[PDB]
């Protein structure tokens, strides 16, 4: 998965990524992560959450 180009355009920048299959680009797509999962992880890191790793995985699946 390698970055190719910032998709042209309230200002959303979606980096597109090409997919190397044995070194050859089988295609490309607009690919991105899910930020609520990152917020769940950061919730689990902090101590003012009461939100453990077991609960973090449970909430990730439920989300």
Ligand X SMILES: CCn1nc(C)cc1C(=O)Nc1nc2cc(C(N)=O)cc(OC)c2n1C/C=C/Cn1c(NC(=O)c2cc(C)nn2CC)nc2cc(C(N)=O)cc(OCCCN3CCOCC3)c21
One of 36, 37, 49, 53 touching ligand X (CB under 6 A): 36
One of 1, 2, 8, 21 touching a copy of itself (CB under 8 A): 8
What DSSP letter does each residue of 36-61 carry, written as one string?
Answer: HHHHHHHHHHSSSS---HHHHHHHHH
Helix %, strand %, coil % of the chain (to 5): 35, 30, 35
Partner from ligand X, a copy of itself, none contacting 5, C-beta within 5 to 8 A by type: a copy of itself
Query: According to the binding rule CB under 8 A, does residue 5 interact with a copy of itself?
Result: yes
Binding site for ligand X (CB under 6 A): 10-13, 35-36, 39
């Amino acid at each position: 998965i390698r970055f190719l180009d910032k998709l042209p355009q309230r200002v959303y920048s979606n980096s597109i990524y090409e997919l190397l299959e044995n070194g050859q680009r089988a295609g490309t797509c607009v690919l991105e992560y899910a930020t609520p999962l990152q917020t769940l992880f950061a919730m689990s890191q902090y101590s003012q959450a009461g939100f453990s790793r077991e609960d973090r995985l449970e909430q990730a699946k439920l989300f």
